[PDB]
Design a protein around this ligand. Sequence first.
Ligand SMILES: [Zn+2]
Lengths: 259, 259
Amino acid sequence: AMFLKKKLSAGKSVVGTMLNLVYNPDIVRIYAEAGLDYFIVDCEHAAYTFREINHLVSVAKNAGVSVLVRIPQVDRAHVQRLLDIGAEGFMIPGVQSAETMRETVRLAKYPPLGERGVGGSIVTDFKPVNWAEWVQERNDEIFIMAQIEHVKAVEDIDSILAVQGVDAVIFGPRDLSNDLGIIGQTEHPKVYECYEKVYRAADRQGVVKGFFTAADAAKMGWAVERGAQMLLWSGDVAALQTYTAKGVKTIKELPGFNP
Amino acid sequence: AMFLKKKLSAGKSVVGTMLNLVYNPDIVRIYAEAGLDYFIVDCEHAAYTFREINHLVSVAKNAGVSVLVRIPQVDRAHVQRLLDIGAEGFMIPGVQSAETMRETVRLAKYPPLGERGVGGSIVTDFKPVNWAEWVQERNDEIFIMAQIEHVKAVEDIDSILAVQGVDAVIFGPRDLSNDLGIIGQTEHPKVYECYEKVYRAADRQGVVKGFFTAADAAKMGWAVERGAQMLLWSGDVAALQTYTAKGVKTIKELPGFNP
Ligand SMILES: [Zn+2]
């Protein structure tokens, strides 16, 4: 019923992409066939409803694909409902303190690790369970990932990543570059310095290393060299814009084309 | 309010793609930005509802993108409603006789060119019109395209393309290759022989030439050389599968990736 942490725990590299536009649940089958392990629904910067997410999850659960959600704020409404619906976990944006992680974990974990409420029906994928065992096992499979976008978070990174229940760390390069006063220069040496500092803290704290690259898959080499297991590349929108624009341009450049 | 025939009439080459998966209406804005003139909603092989099409059209009407629909059969329910909703016209699949075209035109054109019923509201994009002039002008802008998929249609092509109101002709290479007993061999010389025969008839009948290529944009050169104005390349699904699979594969091939 849960696929992501099992892979990470076995030392595997896993590959995901962002989902910002498409809500047709067949995108899940396309992504499975393309060899993706997971994808992240962008509820921070897009309009996805919880019903749409349920539809995605319903297809993903039997396709062997994990659904994570990037939530706009940490509260019970987001965390409780999305885990109950069947997202395997979260990317928490702009994490700046241990407290944000403590609160995420409190909402996401069943007692005694947290205060997540125990529901039924879709919660257990409509299957019967041994409750006492099941809550313990599920707590071990919920995935929590901190996204770092602030210089201040980088400076305080050990405190953030030492919180019990934090599974992985990743970056938001655009916001981070903005915080460095060089918005959009996501390949700047100062940005990579931040990455390095965070990766060293992740190593110290036993936290999985993640990396996002927005356009060129080859740029993931940098993260893979450094032992990053959570690989997040591009997204549906970039796929549609990049592929479509390229072909159209090729066509409009054919000899005989009449503009 | 209508964009496609105006371009074709001016001798322009125009570029479109198939829509089979995405129904988020923002796909229209993505396609406009990518430089597409039109796209074709696949109602023959996919699940699109007329409401979904209305949503697409509502965005397209002010984006300067034309929406065509590939309908599964020619009847009043499809033709009347879709034109009223705001599709600029149709790709009619597997056309095998003049009669199919006569019936398409009868349903699609206002009197005296046809028997299309005159409605209101969305029909005129919610704008007031001079009815007597407006129906005449609209009849000149409705787009009807015959898709050829049978050897028998190729043999009878002059009769099919001579029907008044037929604007353009195109091919369904997979079905055509199937009818030639070589299903899937869409680059076979026998397939191109058919194309040539149809193009010669299109020239004789004053009908616009169209061409579909499923994967490689460069293969459109063949059609462009031959004066084809209706260029139809790939589609949203191929875009998502091709782009995504490529990047994922690149990532999984990085040194240090742990499968
Ligand atoms: Zn969609």
